[PDB]
Amino acid sequence: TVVVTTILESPYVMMKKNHEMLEGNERYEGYCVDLAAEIAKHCGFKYKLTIVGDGKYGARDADTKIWNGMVGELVYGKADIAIAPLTITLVREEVIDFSKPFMSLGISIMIKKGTPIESAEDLSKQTEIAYGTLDSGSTKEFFRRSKIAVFDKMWTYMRSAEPSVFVRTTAEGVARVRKSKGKYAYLLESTMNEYIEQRKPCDTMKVGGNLDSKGYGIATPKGSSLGNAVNLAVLKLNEQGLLDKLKNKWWYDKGEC
Amino acid sequence: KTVVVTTILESPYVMMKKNHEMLEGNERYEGYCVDLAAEIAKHCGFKYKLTIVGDGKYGARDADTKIWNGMVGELVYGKADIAIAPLTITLVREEVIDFSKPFMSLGISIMIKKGTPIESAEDLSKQTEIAYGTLDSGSTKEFFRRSKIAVFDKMWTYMRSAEPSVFVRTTAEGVARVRKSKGKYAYLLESTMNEYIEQRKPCDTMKVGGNLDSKGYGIATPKGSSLGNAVNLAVLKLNEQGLLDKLKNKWWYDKGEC
């Protein structure tokens, strides 16, 4: 029975409305819940969905070099596979294995509707509207490491921002935009931004182009025997059109705005 | 040793320099994949030789003989050490060769001569006046051959049986057929190539509708080759440091004639 680490992040993994009357894997639904079922089916394994203990994606502590989040769970042998919106990055690919990507994304800007910001450049050029990112994820590192002038300017601002502009979860970033009467903008992956734009109260919007282009991968411990089969299953699901089918199911058929 | 790179003459990926005959070796060529090759080599610490695939093909396995042709075949039979090309990551290929994480995204798309009354694949499927086809021997063809979606099965049933053949030997041959056919031919090709041609003179083509699928190009190596790891890490590094996006702009949009 494969221990799968994943994260409560809509619409990837969500507790079902009636989750309290249900047990095990059946408590959960979402894109990655269906994806998990499919990968397991093709690789012929049984599995247990577990929600990452610390609620994080995964970053390395600069001082201890200890990994947190789903990454750390694989690295420390606490999970067998991570099936989640987990961004394929160079620092991570050095410690864990990733499948070929199952979904594309880029960093994007979420505003409360009516906010006068069209681009990352607009953000960078003003101080009235605060902005930040998720903690312990790939978006923060993009800004941390960027040498592109606009993104470096944005970073120099964000990291010294008082009070803090960073949030612990996506939901927190989104609620922060919604309650902030236009004075907070949130930097987050286009997948998540586009999902939220189609849900009530319909008061947010993605503006501008994506800042980069990347993908999510299924992740396994280095040298895991599961990595081969899991990668081939991602390629098969894509070619059968199932990945396209699932994006449609979870994003646009679940639309409200 | 010197790494033999297999690639293909496909704009804007690899093209002959205008003065190539007075130049030598790697210096004869230019394009997105020439720049990318130089950068991969640099970061992986290797010397290399660009070679154009002999049969000028991407790579398919013959149903009867079972031999792989194209750049895939050069890798499978040990003629090349790495392929650095707009080579689409597919399952059938990944079973015989290794791919890096993708360096560029694409989807199958439709190219029409301007003013052609077609907005989608569903439109193409529902009519016979305007003929349509694919490159004869790459991922786009095979996508249609295998597909179980009503619309694309319908399109395939038409293409495979259409006479004269709707399939072409090269991308350039597809594009010239669109341009010469007064709106009576539409070409199915990857979005990257379609969007490039859309920005070149005579500015008489365009991409219509959404992409039919989503996939990536990968750097390919022979299965279990020692280069594969360093190459994958270099692709991730070069994406993260903004080189791939810079190179896309340089070869598509900086060079735009329309």
Ligand SMILES: CC(=O)NC[C@@H]1CC(c2ccc(N3CCCC3)c(F)c2)=NO1
């Ligand atoms: C592996 C595959 O074809 N997956 C289907 C889609 C395509 C995809 C993808 C993600 C990322 C990229 N990149 C990352 C950098 C530029 C292109 C890409 F080309 C394709 N993820 O999901």
Ligand SMILES: N[C@@H](CCC(=O)O)C(=O)O
């Ligand atoms: N997908 C990201 C988390 C979300 C974000 O950083 O915006 C990761 O793997 O770290």
Ligand SMILES: N[C@@H](CCC(=O)O)C(=O)O
């Ligand atoms: N990039 C494709 C070739 C072009 C096409 O099939 O449209 C391949 O690797 O086969």
Ligand SMILES: [Zn+2]
């Ligand atoms: Zn399946």
Ligand SMILES: [Zn+2]
């Ligand atoms: Zn610390």
Ligand SMILES: [Zn+2]
């Ligand atoms: Zn470099």
